[PDB]
UniProtKB/Swiss-Prot annotation, chain A:
Record's signal peptide: none
Keyword terms: Acetylation, Centromere, Chromosome, Disease variant, Epilepsy, Intellectual disability, Kinetochore, Methylation, mRNA transport, Nuclear pore complex, Nucleus, Phosphoprotein, Protein transport, Translocation, Transport
Keyword hit for Transport: yes
Subcellular location field: Nucleus, Nuclear pore complex; Chromosome, Centromere, Kinetochore
Keyword hit for Lipoprotein: no
Protein name: Nuclear pore complex protein Nup133
Subunit structure, as described in the record: Forms part of the Nup160 subcomplex in the nuclear pore which is composed of NUP160, NUP133, NUP107 and Nup96. This complex plays a role in RNA export and in tethering Nup98 and NUP153 to the nucleus.
Organism: Homo sapiens
GO cellular component, one term: cytosol
Result for mutant: residue 65 to R: In NPHS18; loss of function in nephrogenesis; unable to rescue morpholino-induced nephrogenesis defects in Xenopus; decreased interaction with NUP107
Gene Ontology MF annotations: structural constituent of nuclear pore
PTM annotation (Phosphoserine): residues: 224
From Swiss-Prot, chain B:
Name the UniProt record assigns to this protein: Nuclear pore complex protein Nup107
Assembly, per entry: Part of the nuclear pore complex (NPC). Forms part of the Nup160 subcomplex in the nuclear pore which is composed of NUP160, NUP133, NUP107 and Nup96; this complex plays a role in RNA export and in tethering Nup98 and NUP153 to the nucleus. Does not interact with TPR. Interacts with ZNF106.
Organism, scientific name: Homo sapiens (Human)
Disease: Nephrotic syndrome 11: A form of nephrotic syndrome, a renal disease clinically characterized by severe proteinuria, resulting in complications such as hypoalbuminemia, hyperlipidemia and edema. Kidney biopsies show non-specific histologic changes such as focal segmental glomerulosclerosis and diffuse mesangial proliferation. Some affected individuals have an inherited steroid-resistant form and progress to end-stage renal failure. NPHS11 is an autosomal recessive, steroid-resistant and progressive form with onset in the first decade of life.
Subcellular location(s) per record: Nucleus membrane; Nucleus, Nuclear pore complex; Chromosome, Centromere, Kinetochore
Lineage, highest ranks first: Eukaryota, Metazoa, Chordata, Craniata, Vertebrata
Gene (name only): NUP107
Family, per entry: Belongs to the nucleoporin Nup84/Nup107 family.
Known function: Plays a role in the nuclear pore complex (NPC) assembly and/or maintenance. Required for the assembly of peripheral proteins into the NPC. May anchor NUP62 to the NPC. Involved in nephrogenesis.
Disulfide bridge partners, by residue number: none
Amino acid sequence: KRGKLLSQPISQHGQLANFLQAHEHLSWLHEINSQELEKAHATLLGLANMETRYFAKKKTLLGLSKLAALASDFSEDMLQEKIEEMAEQERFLLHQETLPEQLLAEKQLNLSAMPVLTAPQLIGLYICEENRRANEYDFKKALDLLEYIDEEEDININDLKLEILCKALQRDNWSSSDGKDDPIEVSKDSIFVKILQKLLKDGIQLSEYLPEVKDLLQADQLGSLKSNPYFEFVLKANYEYYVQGQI
Amino acid sequence: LIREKHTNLIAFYTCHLPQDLAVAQYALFLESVTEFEQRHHCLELAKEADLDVATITKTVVENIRKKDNGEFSHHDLAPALDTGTTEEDRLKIDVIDWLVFDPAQRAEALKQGNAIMRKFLASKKHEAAKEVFVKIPQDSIAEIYNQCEEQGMESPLPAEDDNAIREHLCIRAYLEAHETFNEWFKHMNSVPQKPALIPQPTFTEKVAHEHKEKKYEMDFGIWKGHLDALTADVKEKMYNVLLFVDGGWMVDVREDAKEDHERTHQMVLLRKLCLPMLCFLLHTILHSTGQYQECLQLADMVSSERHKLYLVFSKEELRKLLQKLRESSLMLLDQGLDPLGYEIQL
């Protein structure tokens, strides 16, 4: 029943800590009860890194770790290090926090009971067919999640980047208008052009960041668009307009 | 003439002065009027005399707002009891009328009404803040837009008043989060007392214990059926304040606004008086009803980069919160769950 482990006398805390070194998921509760808050930060951060089974539990472990670091006598330099080291794991988990409520409902997922997801899994959710509201913010998250992938996953980041851009182009309606209308004006409501306009505002070189127009047209994901000569023209006209617009 | 009580004379004897002095002396008169029929009559006698009624009524309200030579001390966190609405509070409830007699002052009634409510909420006079909230008529938020689409206001949407309407909506959400707690607390203390067991009771006294316990089973079932409902309502209201929209509770949005450092200091103070207190109430509501995992999700709410509530607690209160978080964490372990309320697998 274990509450009794923590309410022991201070004269035994130098035995209790030297046994809780075998149970990290209880040691932070004695570290805080000893006011060794500098340990409690690191213990709760380690437990947050290890907690993959429940998204809302990883969040609460970081919330308690960050509230130990905001209560310990760390120096102003080490405190900014341990604020920023945690702020990037809050930025990562904000991509899982901001999953659409319809996408969660259609997959019958609960944020309070689902696991933590890796960046390819969050990408794979955001770009999926069930995201029947996917837009230039979810297709921005799905590109920004490519910056949270380690060099030891057997995953070509470039083929994810191709498949994200192909699935944006498959949410956009590349059917022909009533023959009066400019395809560089008409493209400005497309989510593909709106993610290009975000990458340009947010400072990125489209001349280095984008796949080739040859090979975005040789990807097979596009399916029915891979036979459409209006799509073939309008894709090229917008690549030409937005990449030449940066030279 | 003030000291025989002005009826019909002072207005003409006051327009024979420069506007700065005319406004100041007619305000110094109206600061002595408590008689509601005489208030209306002695505004129309100024409107028959080419007087600046609008700066007059604003001056009455602002002079009465300024009569407290009281700095916002930090010792008065203390548990004062029974601090109900006094005559010196009523003379600040019964001042908003001066900006409500004429529709052309509903904006100023809300701007000054917020300032008097900021004083009463910081003073723990929640009913006196609700008395001022009832002095502001419920149409006023729409009337401030009516007075901007016909001809024009201090700006084509004022940056004082967009922020003031947002502040009045913050104050209402805080009064909802207090009234629902007051009724939840009245109800929680009403708990049906379990029928005591009589030692060595006769057959008649056993039937006269069954016919008490089999009423307690109904009374306690009804009482909890009301407690869980009040525990949902007060929890909506406390989340509406702690998770209040974008900027958050008692924070502005129009950076095109004029500086008021009295308002800005009082709002930054009220965020530190009210939001930690509501988190300690919400933990106690959830914990006393057995909702122990929601008591822990208060940590994610307090640490959240959207609302930054960790910037409005003291370190000593973040320690008090980590102590209360552990109360629910132990009650989850004594339920056989993990320290955060999840399934232990074996």
